[PDB]
Each structure stands twice: as C-alpha cells, then as structure tokens.
Symmetry: C3
Subunit: 222 residues, 3 copies
Amino acid sequence: TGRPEWIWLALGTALMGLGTLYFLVKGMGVSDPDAKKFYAITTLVPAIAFTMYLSMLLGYGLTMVPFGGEQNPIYWARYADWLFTTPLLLLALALLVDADQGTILALVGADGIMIGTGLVGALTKVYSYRFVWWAISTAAMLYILYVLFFGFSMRPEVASTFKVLRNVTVVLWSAYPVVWLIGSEGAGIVPLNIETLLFMVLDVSAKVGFGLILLRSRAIFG
Amino acid sequence: TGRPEWIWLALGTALMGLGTLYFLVKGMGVSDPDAKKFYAITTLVPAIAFTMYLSMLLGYGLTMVPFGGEQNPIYWARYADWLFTTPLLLLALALLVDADQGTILALVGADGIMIGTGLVGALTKVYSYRFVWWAISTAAMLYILYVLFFGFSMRPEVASTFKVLRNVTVVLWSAYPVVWLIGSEGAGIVPLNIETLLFMVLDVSAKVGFGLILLRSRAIFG
Amino acid sequence: TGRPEWIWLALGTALMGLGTLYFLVKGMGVSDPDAKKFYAITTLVPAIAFTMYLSMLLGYGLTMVPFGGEQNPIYWARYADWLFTTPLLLLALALLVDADQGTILALVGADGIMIGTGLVGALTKVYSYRFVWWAISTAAMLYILYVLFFGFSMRPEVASTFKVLRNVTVVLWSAYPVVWLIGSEGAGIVPLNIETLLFMVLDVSAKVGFGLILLRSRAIFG
Ligand SMILES: CC(C)CCCCCCCCCCCC[C@@H](C)CCCCCCCC(C)C
Ligand SMILES: CC(C)CCCCCCCCCCCC[C@@H](C)CCCCCCCC(C)C
Ligand SMILES: CC(C)CCCCCCCCCCCC[C@@H](C)CCCCCCCC(C)C
Ligand SMILES: *C\C=C(C)/C=C/C=C(C)/C=C/C1=C(C)CCCC1(C)C
Ligand SMILES: *C\C=C(C)/C=C/C=C(C)/C=C/C1=C(C)CCCC1(C)C
Ligand SMILES: *C\C=C(C)/C=C/C=C(C)/C=C/C1=C(C)CCCC1(C)C
C-alpha cells in the first residue's frame, strides 16, 4: 500500500506465522510435563505476534496521534503484542532456573508496568511527557534486567543454557527503548519505515530467534 | 426499546442472574478444596455473563461498525464476556483430568487468541478482512477442541464425567463460529435479532447449562 | 493547573512514588521464598498506583462523560489502578492464611467484577443506570468482605496479623463506594476536588499504609 512500512509488516507477518507452524510441528510428541511448558511458551509467543503483525499489516492495529502539531501514526498493536509475549518470555527464564513465585510476580508485574507506560507514552499528545513515560518504562526494564542478571545449584546444563538466553535478553530487550527513542514515537531521528523495520527485526529475533535457542537445549526437559 | 433484540438480552440477563444466585446458594457449605475450585468457576462464569448481558441490555456494551457502507451494531460486550468465561470453562476441564500446566497454558493462550481475533474481526471495517480474522479465530478453536479430544488412569468417575462435558463442549463451542458467520457480523444471512437470540441460547447453555452438568458429578470432589 | 484537584493528584503521585522506593529499598536482601511474595506485592502495588496517579496528574488518565446534560470529568485511571492493585492486596491476605485456590479464584474474580462494573457505571451516560452499576459493584464488594470475615489452626502470629489487616480492609474498602456515591461520579454532593482528595487519602492508606502494616509482621516469614 501507501504505507512504505507495509513490506516490513508483511515480512514480519510471514516470519511469525512460519515460526508458529514450525514450533507447532516440532512440539508434536512432547510428553514431558516440564518440556511441555517451554513448548507452550515458545509456540504461543510467535502465535500472538503473528496476529499482531497481521493487524498492523491490515491497518487495524494502528492509530493517529497528534504531537508536534502533526498526526503521528502509532502502531498500538506492537504494545498489545509485547504485553502478552514479554511476560511469557520471562516465565520461560524463571522456570528454567526454578525461580521463586515472589520473584516471578515481581518480574511479570514489573513487565506490565514496562509495556503499560510505553503504551501511554506512545499515545500521549504532550510531546514532552512522552519521554517522561519513556524513562519510567526504561526504569522498569532495568529493574527486570537487574533481576535476571543478579538474582539467580542448578544442573550445569540449566546454568549454561540460562547464561546464554540471559545474555541474549539483555542485548535484545535493551535495543527496544533505543529504537523507540530514535524512531517516530520519540525524537523522530529515524523515519517510520526504518522504525518499523528495526522493531520487526527485533521482534522476530526475540520471538522466533529466542525460542529456537531455547528448544535446542535439553535443559528444558525434566 | 427500539432494539428488537432487547427481549433476548433481557431474558439472557435474567437467566444468567438467576443462575448466579443458584450456584451461589448451592455453593454454600463446600469445604472440599477441589470441589471449591469447580464451585468457584461454575459460579463466576454466569456472574460475569450477567454483567455483560446487562451491559448489552442497557446499551453500554454496544458499538456501531461501518462495513458494507452501513452502520452495523456490534455487541463487543459478548467478547469481553467470552474473554473471561471461556478460559475458566477450560480450566474446569483441565482440573477435572489433572492436565499438566503446560497444556493448560497452551489452551488459555489459545483461547485468548480465539476471542481476541473474533473481536478484531467484529470491529474490522474492511468487510473482507473480517472473515480473515474469523478463520484465524476458528483455527484457534479447532486447536483447542483438538487438545480436549486427543490429549487426555483417572478414576472412572472423572473419565466418565469428562467424556460428557467434552462432547458438550465440542457441539456448543462449534456452534459459535457458525452463528457469527451467518449473523450480522459476517455475511448477514440472519438478522441481528435472530443473531442475538442464538448467542443467548448458546451462552445460557454454555454458562448455566454446562455448570449444572458439572456440579452434579462427584468427579469434582476429592 | 486549572484543575483544582491537581494538587491532590500531585501529592498522591509523590507519596506513591516515595512509597515504592521505600518498599524497594526495604525489600533488598529478602531471601525467604514466602517473605518474597509479600515483598513483591507490597512493592508492586504503590508502583502501579504511582503510574496511575501520574497519568491522572498529566491529564492522560482522564476523560469527559456527559451525564445530567454536562461534561463530567472521569478519572478512569483510578479504575485501571484498582483493577490491578485490589487483587494483589487480596492475594496477600489469602497467602497469609494459606487460603485454598478455589477461594482465591472466587475473590479475584469477584474483585474484577467489582472494579469492572464501577468503571462501567463511571462511564455510563444514562444517569440512572450509573447507580445500577454502583449497586452491583457494591454487592461484589460485600461478597468479598463477607469471605475475608467469615471464611478463614494458623500460627497465632498469622491469626493475629490477619485479624488486623482484615479489620483495616473492611473500613478502607467500604469507604470507596461511599465516596463514589457522594462524589461527582454519583449524586454530586461533593465537588470533584474534594472527591479526588478523599480517594487519594484512601489510596495512600490502602497502598502504602496497608503495606507498612503488613511488612512489620513476622507472620510474612516462613
Ligand atoms: C530451524 C530453523 C531453520 C527455523 C526456521 C523458522 C523460520 C522463521 C524465522 C526463524 C529465523 C530467525 C533467525 C534468528 C533471528 C533473527 C536475527 C532473524 C532476522 C530477520 C531478518 C532476515 C533473516 C532471514 C530469515 C528468512 C530467517
Ligand atoms: C436445577 C435447575 C432447575 C436449575 C435452574 C437454574 C436457572 C437458570 C437457567 C438454567 C437452565 C438451563 C437448561 C440447559 C440450557 C439451555 C439449553 C437453556 C435454553 C434457554 C431457553 C429457554 C429454556 C428454559 C429455561 C427457563 C431454563
Ligand atoms: C516507615 C515510614 C515512615 C514510611 C514512609 C513512607 C512514605 C510514604 C507514605 C507512607 C504514609 C502513610 C501513613 C498511613 C496512611 C495514611 C492514612 C496517610 C494519609 C495521607 C495524608 C497526609 C499524611 C502524611 C504523610 C506525609 C505520610
Ligand atoms: C517482542 C518481545 C520482546 C522481548 C519485546 C521487548 C520490548 C521491550 C523491552 C520494550 C521496552 C520499552 C521500554 C523500555 C521503553 C518504552 C517503550 C518500550 C515499550 C519500547
Ligand atoms: C459463553 C461461553 C462459551 C463456551 C463461548 C464460546 C465462544 C466461542 C467458541 C467463540 C468462537 C469464535 C470463533 C471460533 C470464530 C470467530 C468469532 C467467535 C468469537 C464467535
Ligand atoms: C487502591 C486500593 C484499594 C483497596 C481500592 C479499593 C476500591 C474499592 C473497594 C472500590 C469499590 C467500588 C465499589 C464497591 C462501588 C462502585 C465503584 C467502586 C469502584 C468505587
């Protein structure tokens, strides 16, 4: 269509869809209780992103936000997506290391505050206050990364596999507040079409890429 | 009022309300931990549907959606209702057979994608894309029904009782995408007032009817 | 600003923020699994209220609702806040007395119906129906208070500490439907600026005040 970023949303739609079918097929046969949970998560996440990428693609998951005296296209569907996939991602890391419930609850709550305030910042029409919501969101993200780094006698296999995903998580997740900031939602240093491209690359990395990593470990099996 | 379907929403309001009081009364005295969960579920579900039927009844849970060049009344309150009652229904079946968490999470996630995309399809103004969201929703429903059918040494009583509800669930739940499709949200083969009637009959069947079945079994007791 | 109630939202923003940092600091070092959950809850709750008080403060969490032939300012952000903090509050009481899951689910579901219908009543433009939603909300609150009072061999320390919070909960929570009723959302006996003040005093009492109580008990430790 006219939306130059359409190509990226259409690519992202396809990769998430293809990833869901892949995990769906691979997930056939798992009987192991524990392995089951990881499989559930690794398949649910691209499945949610799929519906959200397609809603952005069809124009449903998009709104206009007036700020800086202009009507600014805002894909709220990215946030609806992250609202459900990030806690699930967090769940898989906590199950991995058998984290305590209390910690799990900290993180999930932490995470919803994170997505929640980014959404608010995205939809805020007073330009300045946008970045205020950004900073709080970012602060919740740092909280979360702090816990995954500095809060965790597991089998060496789990230790090893979690070390990897944890290092992935820091670098991926960290990238998000930077794209937002440079993209059209923030300072507008990068146009919408490059903005959409970057988030798609991260989303696919974070959805499908992360899961491909995780299900390759036998740390997920009881 | 002027909305011919008002009678159906008013009837449905009354039956859900009456059902909540019935399960509330019947639920007095249960001390059994396990029985408790089933009682919670069987009472919560008509209680939620009650508030949603009344919101449609008062006109709050209703919006207009322009498609086919006409303003089309859409009861989003049906979806808000199904968003919370269907996973609870699913929970009761999984507890019944002691399903694994991973499976439970599959289903609930599956289920939210189901309701979520129907809502999107209902609110989508490009007529054609409506049915695209329909098909994905339906695909999530088939996923779910597949798992309940082909995924489950329980006491014979549980086995027996689950066989029943499982057969109920297939036939009830299956009816929904068919009414949507023939109703005003889809191809408009059936008018709004008959559409509302059909969903009310299913909702009461699915809410109160299903629960009356379930609490009659001693499969729910420890 | 022009909104006379701004001072109250700005005060409330500060107290919730200060409370989050306090619980955050105090929560450093807890290793006890169980104590962990209480700490998570006691810190998450003011953290959520913080983001909601600030959104009301910046004008984001506010809408206009026409009723009585006038445009009536409605802080929906109070409800978004209560939607997430009240079940967490309820969780802490149930963990305290080790309540059964089924009971927990009763309460949380009960609680969402409570906040949900108040939000609907707040946003309902037919003046009369507002109070209908009020009464249902209030009925769910009475349900909840009934269970906390009449539904619970714990260590004497837990017994003792729960008796206190339970008496706090009744008096605090009960105050809410009364302020709503006398405030601008209901009969308009009290102006918006006094209305906002009262809810702020309750919110801080209910958020920070309640948590300060709870974390002082060693009933929270295993
Ligand atoms: C076992 C394999 C081959 C899995 C195939 C699943 C297919 C879908 C997506 C999986 C690919 C992801 C690789 C890691 C993550 C990313 C950094 C991908 C960046 C996206 C941009 C283009 C890369 C090419 C692709 C077509 C995979
Ligand atoms: C123990 C009994 C009698 C329970 C009474 C609870 C009352 C409320 C609703 C319960 C009835 C549901 C029966 C099964 C489900 C359905 C197929 C009902 C279809 C609805 C249409 C009219 C039927 C008559 C009714 C008034 C129950
Ligand atoms: C250990 C202590 C001092 C904790 C400090 C945390 C700071 C933030 C808020 C905590 C205060 C709450 C006390 C109980 C609850 C309320 C009834 C407060 C009513 C609010 C109005 C003004 C009162 C003064 C305050 C500045 C605390
Ligand atoms: C798709 C899945 C992943 C891992 C998404 C992660 C997203 C974030 C970490 C987003 C963070 C945000 C913050 C920190 C700043 C404000 C806005 C964002 C929502 C982009
Ligand atoms: C009220 C409780 C029950 C069991 C409701 C069940 C509803 C469904 C199975 C709905 C399914 C939908 C699908 C499959 C197709 C798109 C739209 C619907 C939401 C009607
Ligand atoms: C901030 C935390 C607390 C404990 C909030 C509690 C709020 C309530 C008990 C609210 C109750 C409502 C009812 C009973 C009546 C309709 C509207 C309200 C949402 C105010």
